[PDB]
Structure formats: C-alpha cells, structure tokens
Amino acid sequence: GKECDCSSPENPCCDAATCKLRPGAQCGEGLCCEQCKFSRAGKICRIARGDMPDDRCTGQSADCPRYH
C-alpha cells in the first residue's frame, strides 16, 4: 500500500517527508477533500454524461474514482 496522502511538497496539508498529511486534516488534496477534510458522502466528483451514470464521493474518500 502506498503512503502518499497528496502529491505536492509545498502543500502544508501534506508532509513531503512521508508524502502524507502534515496537519490533523483527513486529506490534503482530492476531488472529495474540502478544507483538507473528507467531503460528505454523495459528493458529485465525476458527472459522467452520456449512457453512463454520474459518480459521487463516499464522503470518506479524498480523490474521485470512476465507474469501473
């Protein structure tokens, strides 16, 4: 399992020394992370349009996955 919470050294919400969060924030960066914290569940991170449905964050995830 990797150990990177974000992907930026100048990010204060992430300790480049470990690549994880530096503060007590639940996340430092992610389409589902607001204010360095996990957004609530049902966060439309990906609104896939067409013959596919949309995508909502589980409220505990930081970034946003896809349908498959």
Q: Into how many domains does the chain fold?
A: 1
Q: Is 62 exposed, middle or buried (0-12, 13-18, 19+ CB in 10 A)?
A: buried
Distance CA 45, CA 22 (A): 24
Q: Closest by alpha carbon to 61, among 8, 47, 40? A: 40
Distance CA 2, CA 18 (A): 10
59 forms bridges with which residues in the sheet? Answer: none
Q: What are phi and psi of 33, to 5 degrees?
A: -110, 115
The CATH number of residue 10's host domain is 4.10.70.10
Distances (CA, A) of 58 to 13, 22, 23, 35, 65: 21, 23, 22, 17, 10
Residue numbers of the domain that contains 68: 1-68
3 contacts 20 by C-beta, under 8 angstroms: yes
Distances (CA, A) of 10 to 5, 14, 68: 13, 8, 32
